[model samples]
Target: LPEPFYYLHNFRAVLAWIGERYADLLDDQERAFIAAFAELPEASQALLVRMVMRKGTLFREGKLAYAEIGDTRAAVQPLLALGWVDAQPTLELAQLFGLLKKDELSQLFRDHLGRANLRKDALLERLQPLFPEARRLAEWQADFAEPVYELRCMALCDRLRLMYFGNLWQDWSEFVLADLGIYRYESVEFSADSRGFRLRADVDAYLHLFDCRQRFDLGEPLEELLAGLPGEPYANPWLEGRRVKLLFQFAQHCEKQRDFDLAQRLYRQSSHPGARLRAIRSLERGERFAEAHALAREASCAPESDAERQGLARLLPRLQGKLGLPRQARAAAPEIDRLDLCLAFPSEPCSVEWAVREHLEEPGCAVHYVENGLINSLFGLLCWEAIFAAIPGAFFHPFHSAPADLHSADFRQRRAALFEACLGRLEDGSYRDAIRCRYRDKFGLQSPFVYWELLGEELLEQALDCLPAAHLRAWFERLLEDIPGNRAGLPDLIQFWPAQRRYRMVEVKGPGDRLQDNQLRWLQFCREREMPVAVCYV
Candidate 1:
């Protein structure tokens, strides 16, 4: 190192730190480029390194042609080819460092003006969550005459420090954190029991359904406590909904016990419409079909919620026919798409059934975990921004559903174009190569998406190599078509027969789960288009 600085400026220290750490994170190609960078004469190194500080990560294709460095194009070529930059809008930090030497600011660093210090206080109480030494950083900031810019620089600088070191570009937000060594989520053992509980949440959080059939095991006293709720629900708005849920559960519990009298009483007192409908259904179970049909007709007029509408619409049409009422065929039947009709298991586990089903056919045990969220990371390598950017009326919600603000005219008018543009890029293949390179970055980083919890990189690579882009792209299009609706409805499994280059999409369902409406739309589309898909009743 040409004459190591005894104690350089804060800005110089930052560069030294990033440069030292990031070298380890670089791949061989980047290291080789930097290898040449190291071979540069000190005079050139000083000039070029200074320029890099000024340019940050990205500049126009030739912004450096007239740069002080000799052979600007050769210098620029390595950065561009190594995928260290993009045409995307980059930060402009040129002015930020300029303050270091300004008389007012410099004086604060020592005998530091009314502000800065040999005090060395960063005084960063505001940065408690971000930096361990933030209080000192905040204290140091008080030494500055105008600290807003300084504070902004600290924040930006911290980001640079992080980016320069590591974080794979292709992973999801939390995974990005993992790459930075910032956050790691180790899986936990989840238990389901007879505690009258709903469910153990999926960390992925793609589901809204949270019911457990395990209620069969609640103790006798708990059952009695539930049985008593119909007549004397604790009066409070806070637990009103919960009270109803308990009453409904009690009603179902009583029905399962074949205590129709108690079941009917609880269903009558339960305020939930579903509970009320259960009351009417209890009449049919008691062989009072005429009474059940009369009550069903009255209950069928206008349902309270979609789930209620579905529940009623499902039985209303069927019961009317069974009651000898003329089946007034409606335009189309309400779609009853459910994932698990028996046990409400996360979609992935059911894919085991798909693998077995495929094996029984021409394939045996070849069902790979090529499911949607399961494979999203592979292709998402480069398109997270495009695929998820909010357009006019909608954006990707934190919960992973695309929520729309179609209620506001201005947002819809302006944002619709952005939504359309995202899909447009998909068809033209404009984002393909970048996407593949992005995919590789995460894949190489050991970011797992394919064969999640199973299989090796060998199998993962072959899946990508064998599966047509058209296939992935087709699924992506359906997701974008109605993001909120389609995001979670993808087929549960993609079992491939790799030798013949053939694959089939499998939708897994338990005894009671049915295909959702949007899911059916996709199933029909794939069917007509000759895409092989089967619904496996697990």
Candidate 2:
């Protein structure tokens, strides 16, 4: 067990404050600092020490200290100050940081830039002397400048400040010229009551700078701008649809570039439903099957338009098919008893009798009868073997009695007639070398064997012949431990002693190729120990 550390609530509060204020400064250094603090729980001066340490080292220590304290509010303060947690004290920030990692944050930053065209050389030369920690600061600054960065900035800036800056009636002449590069804002006149600023810049200039093109061909400038923006305000209806449209344009551009990953990130960052929908579609088109499937499933179940339902229906099957059921055996049946049959079939829990009854009640009774009857016959053979082995003088034989006339033949004859009936019919045929390749691919060579112990000797032998050797041994061992009351049954088949009498085991194998040496060893072990072990195949 790890050592426990506890801090006073006041200390926790102070730590939280420091974290909130300097989260950015402490970002890279949090983990190590936390570890160090954990090791030295009595370090009273840890926080103060961190304040005076190098930014990188101090940040690392702060994080370590935060983790030791285990106070979420305290932990968040540092990250919040660092711009890691958005300014809003919403559940989203809590959730985001719960599993956050430095690499992921770095990746988010990298992705925000759209491309790796950061002027590393220029940034390095500019702040090399002024800030010894310029490299780290520059990298963070670049990340901060991304369009998504606006959310963090806005969060940092008081909401009242936003309301003030957001006012349309503010003096716009000099501001527009300096900020938007509009030389003649005065030429555009506003109505007498109009309080909003007017710009000389065309709509295209703003749109282009924001990379608001459906086909994202314009470049990284827009991604950078959007990354710097405050929360997904474009998702708000109050913005008069302008923000939403711009986001849509961005999403479309991502789709065009085939950057589904980045598109997904941006989609999640947005609050606009339209943008989210487009992002989902782009993910599907790009063959991000799992994500697309989940989105489609969600949308299919949503209270949306009939058109949305229709779209979901069209998209769902393709996704479902990609994750279809596992490949199974063809005509070649591996012998298995009733108990083992219960364990391996369907791969999921299902009632065999219920399935049979349902098939019997279907409209195509004749075909169903033949198919289901054959299956029942096979199971009947297995049951007979079990009963025969257990009962004295209960001899049973295979269907050796066939009628002379093909049409007049009895049940045995009909069953025998279908013995070679399209043996490999159900084998996976989508890919070349479907049978061997898929079998090997689905069940790796060293995969464990499925086993049960209630089967008889002959059936067990048949089952053993179908599985690989390594798994058969493991299956036999499991059976030895699981089965009950095998000691005094049959000395020749299974010998029992007082010390080993407690052991009972069973093994099962599905229909496949021959068993290996390990399987034989397991069988021999059971025989030597007087343990009643059996192998069954399905």
Candidate 3:
């Protein structure tokens, strides 16, 4: 007589079979239904068993009880009786049926249900007519109060509710349980007044809540919820006891709020190593430079290893300057070693003036002098300048040329000297011939300069053919001898090079360059020994 009495019959048959098979596990009421299943024919018994085991059949139970019955109150009872859902109904479950209302519950169900494989259209078709009242009830239930419930009830409600609506209710239920301290009830207990939960419970609850919230769109209110949680005095004892995860949450919360001051304070309070590091990073991001520097220094002193200490030590000075402290001038000043002086002005007498100045300013300082690399850079700069200068109208290009400040005197002198030594005495062709000879001896090539000479000569010929001989010669000579020098050159290029060489006792820069401040000092030592101090670029 009913629209789908046949489906009900099939449902009852399956339920009967489940009861019989799990008789020992079933309750007294369920066992009574098992006896009636024996009256069915052999074929019916097989049918019932098969139906009970079908995945669809179990899912349909939720549809029939909640969707079709149109009565979560009615639906929840059967699911609870069957032990399919938890014994207790959660606040989320009650909220889903309008028995309760929780802001977070609907979101949970929506997320959880959307992931179900059921054809929503077809499910509604089967359920719409038979449980028209149930449908109305569900709609009504959607607007109920969301009172917090005991842990068992929450789990039960979650399971049954998801079956009816799919997992859409998952997040809401999870949040409710986490907030209510149900998720960790075994280990976490709320205070009698519920004014505040215990620290262990708070930590466990927050940890679980944080993880579960990631599964759904919890919305912006999540920030408010997190903020509302206990602060320092009321902070979870477990978190304070160095629970790495809880401390991380504490730091993350502080960081999110842009409370760098609070974050730094919490970081120091946290015993967890990772939390401390994160707090330090947060402080750095806020540009609390002085605080960050102090923390770094402290970290360096307590570093676990020499390597860590060294790395922190290196970071300290850089951070100090970042904090608006004037960088120590003594530290900023470049030191010269013997090798650097030798490379800068190999032929000139080394003057001890700059070297003595550095020594007087910083006695027994460890200097990091660079030579070969600097010389390479200077040579590269000069070569490019020559290429651009030689063919202003033509498409002649230099290899690896960077923008040059031709107006700078340092640029003019260093570049002029390098170009002169390399391209000077063209009539003798000694520079080109020397390079060619070297290539022949080393690689058996007629061209010693390789690509460099090839390109340079092509541009030179183009210029010679286009311009008057006087103009061309004038340009070439100008490139060779227009030495430039300035105050800036005294330190960076000149002073740095010579000083590095004197102290480190290393040769820097190629020949044909004037004595930089440090180079003169090195030459003084060389001259005293009467040794040939001149150096060649090649």
Top lDDT prediction, candidate number? 1
Of candidates 2 and 1, the better by lDDT: 1
Cand. 1 Cα-lDDT: 0.47
Candidate 3 TM-score over all chains jointly: 0.27
**238-313 per-residue lDDT for model 2 (tens digits):** 3424555566666666767788777776765554535556656777777787887777767767724433443554
Question: Residues 343-390, candidate 1, lDDT per residue (tens digit)?
Answer: 334556444555444444553336654445544554444344433344
Among these predictions, the greatest TM-score belongs to 1
Model 2: lDDT equals: 0.36
Estimate the TM-score of every prediction: 0.36, 0.22, 0.27
Reference-based lDDT, each prediction? 0.47, 0.36, 0.38
Q: Evaluate model 3: give its lDDT.
A: 0.38
